[PDB]
Every structure is written in C-alpha cells, then in structure tokens.
Amino acid sequence: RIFVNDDRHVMAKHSSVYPTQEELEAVQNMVSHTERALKAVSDWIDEQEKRTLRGVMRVGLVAKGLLLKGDLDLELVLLCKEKPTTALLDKVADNLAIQLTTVTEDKYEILQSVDDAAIVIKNTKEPPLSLTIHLTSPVVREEMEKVAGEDPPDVLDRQKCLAALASLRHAKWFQARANGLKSCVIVIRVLRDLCTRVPTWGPLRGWPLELLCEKSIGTANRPMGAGEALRRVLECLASGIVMPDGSGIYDPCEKEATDAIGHLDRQQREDITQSAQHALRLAAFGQLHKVLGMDPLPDYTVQIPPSTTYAITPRP
Amino acid sequence: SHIPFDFYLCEMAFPRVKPAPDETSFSEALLKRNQDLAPNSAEQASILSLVTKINNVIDNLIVAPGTFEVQIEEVRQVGSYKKGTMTTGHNVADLVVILKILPTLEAVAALGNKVVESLRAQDPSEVLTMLTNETGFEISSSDATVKILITTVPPNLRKLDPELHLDIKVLQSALAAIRHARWFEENASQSTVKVLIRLLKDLRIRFPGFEPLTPWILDLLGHYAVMNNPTRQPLALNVAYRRCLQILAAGLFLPGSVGITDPCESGNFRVHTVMTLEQQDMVCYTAQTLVRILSHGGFRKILGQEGDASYLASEISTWDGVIVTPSEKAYEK
Numbered sequence: 001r002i003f004v005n006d007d008r009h010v011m012a013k014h015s016s017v018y019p020t021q022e023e024l025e026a027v028q029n030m031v032s033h034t035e036r037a038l039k040a041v042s043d044w045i046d047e048q049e050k051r052t053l054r055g056v057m058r059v060g061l062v063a064k065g066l067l068l069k070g071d072l073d074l075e076l077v078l079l080c081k082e083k084p085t086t087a088l089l090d091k092v093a094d095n096l097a098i099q100l101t102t103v104t105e106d107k108y109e110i111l112q113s114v115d116d117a118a119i120v121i122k123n124t125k126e127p128p129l130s131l132t133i134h135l136t137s138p139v140v141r142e143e144m145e146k147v148a149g150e151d152p153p154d155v156l157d158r159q160k161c162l163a164a165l166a167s168l169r170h171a172k173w174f175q176a177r178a179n180g181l182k183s184c185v186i187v188i189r190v191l192r193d194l195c196t197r198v199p200t201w202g203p204l205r206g207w208p209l210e211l212l213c214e215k216s217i218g219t220a221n222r223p224m225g226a227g228e229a230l231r232r233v234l235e236c237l238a239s240g241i242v243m244p245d246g247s248g249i250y251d252p253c254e255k256e257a258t259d260a261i262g263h264l265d266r267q268q269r270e271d272i273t274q275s276a277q278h279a280l281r282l283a284a285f286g287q288l289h290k291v292l293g294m295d296p297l298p299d300y301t302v303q304i305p306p307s308t309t310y311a312i313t314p315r316p
Numbered sequence: 317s318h319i320p321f322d323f324y325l326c327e328m329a330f331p332r333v334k335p336a337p338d339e340t341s342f343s344e345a346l347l348k349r350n351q352d353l354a355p356n357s358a359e360q361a362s363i364l365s366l367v368t369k370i371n372n373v374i375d376n377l378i379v380a381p382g383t384f385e386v387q388i389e390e391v392r393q394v395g396s397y398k399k400g401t402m403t404t405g406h407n408v409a410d411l412v413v414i415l416k417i418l419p420t421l422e423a424v425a426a427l428g429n430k431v432v433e434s435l436r437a438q439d440p441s442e443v444l445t446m447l448t449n450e451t452g453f454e455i456s457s458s459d460a461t462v463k464i465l466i467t468t469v470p471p472n473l474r475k476l477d478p479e480l481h482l483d484i485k486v487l488q489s490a491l492a493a494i495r496h497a498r499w500f501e502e503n504a505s506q507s508t509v510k511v512l513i514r515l516l517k518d519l520r521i522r523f524p525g526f527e528p529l530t531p532w533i534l535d536l537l538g539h540y541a542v543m544n545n546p547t548r549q550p551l552a553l554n555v556a557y558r559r560c561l562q563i564l565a566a567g568l569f570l571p572g573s574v575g576i577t578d579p580c581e582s583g584n585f586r587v588h589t590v591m592t593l594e595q596q597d598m599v600c601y602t603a604q605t606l607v608r609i610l611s612h613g614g615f616r617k618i619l620g621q622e623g624d625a626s627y628l629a630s631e632i633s634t635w636d637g638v639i640v641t642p643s644e645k646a647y648e649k
C-alpha cells in the first residue's frame with residue numbers, strides 16, 4: 001500500500017506493548033472464574049424459595065481488548081433488576097466467596113466498597129490482578145432521566161451506578177464501531193502507551209482517545225494500515241480538533257449532547273495540539289520512531305475468548 | 317494517495333456539541349481588511365485605462381499587415397487583474413503575447429517600442445516609459461504599469477536555441493499563466509474565493525514562514541478552501557479562512573500527501589512539490605502555530621490589524637493565561 005516503513009514501526013511497537021501470553025492466561029482465568037461464580041451466585045439467589053441478578057457483562061480494557069503489558073485492572077458490570085442496595089452488595093460479596101470454591105481453588109481476596117457500589121477481587125499472583133465488579137441497574141438511568149420533570153433505604157451511589165451503565169454503553173459501542181475498523185484497536189493500544197509515557201497526552205487516555213481514533217480512522221475513504229491510520233489521528237489533532245472553539249468530541253453514548261473532552265482546560269488542549277502537530281511532521285519526515293519512543297528498526301482484535309458463562313450477541 | 321485530515325470533508329462525523337461560536341467580529345474584520353487591501357477607485361481606473369489602450373494596440377498589430385502580423389499569434393489577459401485579486405499599492409497587470417516567430421531579445425524590444433509608440437501618437441500629452449526585461453517588457457504610466465509576458469506557439473518550443481531565443485522556462489511560464497487564467501475563470505470566479513486569495517497574499521507577506529507559497533498555489537488553496545467540499549456549496553469567508561490554516565496544519569502540503577493536483581498540467585502533478593522538504597516543514601509549522609493563535613482569539617493580530625505579528629510564529633506568547641509555544645522545525649538534513 002503506502003507508508004510501509006511506518007507500518008513496520010507501529011507494528012513493532014504494538015508487539016512491545018501487547019501483553020504476554022502469561023498475562024492473558026491469568027486474565028482469562030480470573031475473568032472466567034468471576035463469571036461462573038457470579039452466575040452461580042445468581043442461581044443461588046433465584047433459588048431463594050422459588051431474576052434479581054440480570055447478567056454479568058465485560059467492560060473497559062477487557063471487553064474492548066486494550067490490555068497491555070503491565071495492566072492489572074479488569075472490570076465487570078453486574079446488572080440488577082432493581083436499584084442495587086448495600087444489602088445486596090453484602091449478600092453477593094459473601095456468597096461470591098463461597099461460589100468461587102465451586103470452580104477453582106485459587107485464593108481470591110474479596111473487598112466490597114459501598115462507596116464505589118462495587119466488589120473488588122484480587123488474586124494472589126505477583127503482582128496481583130485486580131478485577132472490579134460494578135453493581136448497577138437500568139432503573140438508575142430511567143429515574144435520573146424522568147427526574148426531565150416526571151423504596152429501600154440503602155440504595156447505592158447513583159453517580160457510580162450511572163458511570164457503570166455508561167461504561168457498558170461504551171463497551172457495546174466499541175465492539176460495534178471501533179472493533180471492526182481496520183487498524184483502529186492497534187492504533188489505540190499504541191497511543192494508549194504514548195498517553196502513558198507522555199504526560200501531555202495523559203488527559204486523552206481512555207474513552208476520549210478511543211472516540212478520537214474511531215472518528216479519525218473511520219472518516220477515511222478507505223481501509224488503512226497501522227502507519228497511515230496513525231498519521232490520520234495526528235492530522236486530526238493537528239488541525240485543532242480539541243482546541244477550545246473546536247467542535248470537540250461528541251459522546252455517542254449520551255442522550256444529552258456531551259463533549260468527551262470537555263474536561264480538558266485551555267492549556268491542556270494547547271499542549272496536546274502543539275504536541276500532535278509536531279508528531280505529524282516528524283512522521284511526515286521519516287521520524288515516526290521518535291514519536292513511538294523506539295529506535296529506528298534495522299485476529300489482532302481478540303485478546304481473550306468471549307464469555308461462555310454468559311453470552312452477548314456480536315462492523316459492516 | 318494519502319489525503320490528510322480535513323474537517324470540512326466530514327462535518328457529519330463530527331457533530332458539534334454546543335452551538336457554533338459567534339464569529340461576527342472575525343467576519344467583519346475579514347471584510348474590513350479586504351477593503352484596506354483592495355485597490356481604490358483611482359487605481360482601478362488607471363490600470364483599466366492602461367490595459368485597454370495597450371490591448372487594442374496589440375489587437376490591431378495582430379491583424380495589421382506588417383512586421384508584427386507575421387510575429388504575433390494572440391494576446392491574453394492574465395494574473396490578478398483578470399482574476400480580480402489585485403492589491404492596492406501594486407497596480408500592475410499582465411498580458412501574455414504569443415509570437416508566431418521564435419522569441420528573440422531583439423524582437424521583444426522592437427515590439428515594446430512599437431506598442432509604446434502607438435500610444436504616444438494617440439496621446440502625446442501622457443507620459444509613458446517602456447523598459448524591456450527577461451520575460452518580455454512593461455509599459456508604465458504614472459499610476460499603473462502593464463507587464464507583457466512574451467512566449468511563442470507550442471510548435472516553436474521544440475525548436476529553440478538557447479543562444480538566440482528566450483529561455484524555455486520563461487516561455488513555458490507565460491503559457492502556463494494563460495492556462496491558470498482560463499482555469500480560474502471557469503472554476504474559481506466566486507466572490508468569496510477572490511477575497512480569500514487577496515487575504516492570503518497579505519498573510520504570506522506578513523509571515524515569512526509562508527514565503528515559499530507561490531501565487532498559483534495560493535489560487536488553488538483559495539479555491540480549495542472555499543469550494544472543495546461534499547455539499548459543493550461555497551463556505552463562509554470566515555470558515556474558509558480558518559480551513560486554510562487547518563489543512564496546512566494537517567499536512568496538506570507535506571510528504572506523503574496528495575496535496576492539491578495541478579489542473580493545468582499533466583497528469584497528476586502535486587503543486588506543493590515545487591517546495592523543498594525544509595520549506596514544506598516551515599509552511600506547515602507556521603500554519604500550525606496560527607491555527608492555535610486563532611483558537612485563542614488572535615484574529616486581529618493574524619489579519620494585520622495590530623502592527624507587526626511575525627514574531628507570533630517564533631516567540632512564546634500568552635493568550636489570556638494560555639502559554640503558546642510556536643511549532644518548531646522537525647525536518648533535518
């Protein structure tokens with residue numbers, strides 16, 4: 001095609017940040033254990049003299065396949081029929097400890113956080129993986145919504161619950177829009193690393209960066225290799241897309257019009273734009289390796305198998 | 317094959333969060349500067365007068381059995397005069413005269429005399445001066461000057477002699493000027509496009525980083541920014557101006573980019589390749605800095621309404637607490 005040398009560097013860099021098989025085996029196991037145990041916790045509640053726990057969904061890095069060397073943070077979302085209460089958080093955390101013994105002997109540390117509306121599970125490897133189970137319910141959104149004008153005493157934080165719901169929207173949006181897009185997930189992984197080692201790019205990390213890459217790579221007239229797809233992301237930024245008077249990044253997972261980068265102050269937008277503008281010309285003049293923090297050189301979407309415990313139905 | 321990012325090629329994929337900011341001041345400042353830069357009533361009349369006189373003398377020499385009937389094929393008006401992109405203070409118009417014979421330095425000086433003599437006979441009271449150059453010659457009144465760009469017929473080009481006739485470069489440029497004029501009149505004759513090109517000429521002159529940009533490149537860049545978009549409708553002067561800064565910043569004229577193709581050459585020449593890698597880098601990082609200076613509301617500075625501003629592209633400036641650091645060189649060797 002074109003940009004063959006950039007393709008090489010962006011791909012050689014992708015490998016350097018892609019997790020080891022030992023890392024993936026661990027995540028796959030831990031994730032799979034938590035699911036079969038949460039499902040079991042569900043059957044146990046449904047069998048309470050007769051559902052309450054609707055389902056368990058993957059979100060964040062795990063769902064989107066954006067794990068990298070050194071990532072220890074995994075996420076799940078537990079959907080509840082009604083608004084989740086501190087009483088339920090406790091009922092689940094307690095039984096989770098028991099139901100885990102039905103699928104594995106691996107010792108897990110379970111710590112519930114009523115302030116985060118979540119249950120945290122830590123394995124015993126070194127360093128340990130940490131998977132966070134967020135509790136939430138659609139009812140949490142509906143209500144907030146009708147509020148637009150239009151129970152229990154220990155209902156969990158609503159802000160935390162809305163964020164969990166949002167996280168679920170994002171993961172479904174990502175699998176629908178960004179996953180099938182050639183080079184998108186690859187460019188995101190590599191830029192996630194760039195956001196990690198270059199503080200200026202920090203504020204872009206996460207949801208904003210994901211949207212950015214999907215819109216810039218997506219608006220292209222044709223499929224792109226990793227090299228060219230990456231330059232289009234820099235070009236987009238270079239044009240001043242995140243500058244104050246710009247259009248901003250329209251969040252596709254919000255009913256109300258929301259800016260995905262509305263949290264960046266003026267100086268941050270200035271530093272990010274000026275940085276990307278320089279990275280662009282470096283790439284243009286055969287120095288993309290510098291942008292990637294590497295020396296000049298001399299089926300990528302799936303990281304772990306989709307759930308067998310609970311399943312979801314999976315770009316044109 | 318790589319087409320750099322251009323927001324106005326995909327507005328739909330970037331829904332605005334809030335309503336578009338009000339740029340009435342910026343819009344009114346753009347017009348104001350155009351008024352400043354546009355030729356005055358006197359100037360328009362001087363160059364009109366002078367071009368008309370000279371053109372008729374040449375129209376007459378073409379069908380006037382004589383030395384120059386066997387010499388001149390045709391004559392075409394070209395440049396900002398024909399396009400309507402002239403600038404006050406530079407009242408110069410261009411005419412391309414195509415010779416049937418091989419263009420020598422002597423036939424050119426002789427043609428210049430002939431033309432300036434016809435005028436002096438029609439109106440001996442008016443003072444005119446006529447000087448020859450490398451490209452042809454020029455006749456100046458006290459208020460305006462008309463440049464004659466000399467060339468010959470295409471069949472003749474393959475038969476030149478570097479020792480007797482003008483340099484092929486010059487002859488080709490003149491012919492190209494006619495192509496640019498014809499294309500501009502059929503594709504770029506829109507009100508906003510003319511105002512933008514004038515404003516772009518001023519921009520270049522006030523930011524030395526834009527120096528490498530040729531006039532022809534400014535015409536295409538001006539037409540592109542205004543007309544080249546999905547809807548096909550013309551953009552507002554303000555929107556198209558910012559777009560000009562944005563596409564340069566996004567690397568329109570960088571290596572690997574298709575840039576803009578020359579509609580007056582074959583088959584798919586990239587007009588920006590006339591620049592050096594070093595210059596492309598400069599054009600880009602100069603535009604990149606102005607993109608940011610504009611977002612911070614420095615349009616008056618950028619438009620030339622607040623004195624010198626060329627330092628804005630080399631010095632650190634702070635705009636309402638925001639520290640702006642000019643984009644720096646990236647190309648090496």
Ligand SMILES: Nc1ncnc2c1ncn2[C@@H]1O[C@H](COP(=O)(O)OP(=O)(O)OP(=O)(O)O)[C@@H](O)[C@H]1O
Binds near residue numbers: 396397402406
């Ligand atoms: N470096 C160049 N590259 C391509 N075309 C050029 C170049 N320089 C001049 N021309 C062409 O020559 C013709 C006239 O030259 P000129 O420098 O006078 O431009 P212009 O449009 O007339 O601007 P001005 O109003 O300042 O005279 C134009 O039609 C333009 O296309």
Ligand SMILES: [Mg+2]
Binds near residue numbers: 394395396397409
């Ligand atoms: Mg001219």
